[PDB]
């Protein structure tokens with residue numbers, strides 16, 4: 001097939017970046033953009049657009065344009081750094097300092113999502129993007145297809161139960177902690193980043209993946225982890241908690257000693273303004 005006329009009218013299409021995502025240039029500015037093509041479905045995209053449109057944060061990808069045609073076309077900011085996945089696959093591993101910098105941004109982003117009643121639900125290295133090929137860069141969270149937006153129970157809670165089934169009243173205990181699955185995921189990501197390997201795999205083990213994850217008994221290889229700070233590992237331990245009510249929240253993660261690191265925050269602050277130079281309007285003194 002070919003690209004929709006309306007797309008072609010504003011953009012020039014180029015090479016594939018992943019798979020699908022294509023490189024493209026905006027005609028008006030000659031600036032580079034990324035276009036994620038989603039083949040026809042309707043629902044994931046409806047919410048994804050609605051979410052991207054409303055969100056406004058440095059560590060969350062922005063939407064630039066949208067095309068509802070033979071397929072779905074979503075125009076996004078281009079991340080030249082590529083995926084985080086590509087930085088950690090094949091037991092590659094990030095220096096602890098880069099992990100902190102990246103994870104801190106992930107935390108702010110996800111904190112931001114939660115503050116705004118949105119749960120990502122699909123956090124992985126491939127949905128974290130780097131802004132440049134420098135290992136010091138901004139990261140942005142991407143791919144909100146699987147996100148949820150946060151009352152049925154709450155309404156049911158307003159009547160005399162009496163006809164109200166037991167299992168429902170039992171769900172009140174945990175209701176409202178769905179966001180914790182993102183904290184789990186963050187935990188698994190931080191592990192991978194620091195160690196170069198996954199906490200729960202089927203590589204060289206006879207216990208099922210399901211069993212590992214429900215038990216929380218992750219694969220700890222001291223040879224590798226000795227290189228890593230105890231603070232770092234401590235924070236991982238608090239995110240990989242099986243009980244969602246006990247699990248670390250983004251706030252608790254951000255207050256964790258491993259992140260009280262003024263140098264790292266500085267570098268991130270420096271990277272922020274460096275990106276904003278482009279848009280910086282003059283302002284009132």
Ligand SMILES: NC(=O)c1ccc(-c2cc(-c3cccc4c3OCO4)cnc2N)cc1
Nearest residue numbers: 017018034036077078079080082083142143
């Ligand atoms: N699944 C998503 O929603 C999503 C959207 C866009 C991007 C994205 C990818 C890339 C990219 C990926 C691999 C290699 C590269 C890339 O750019 C330069 O070389 C860049 N920008 C993006 N916004 C990823 C996931």
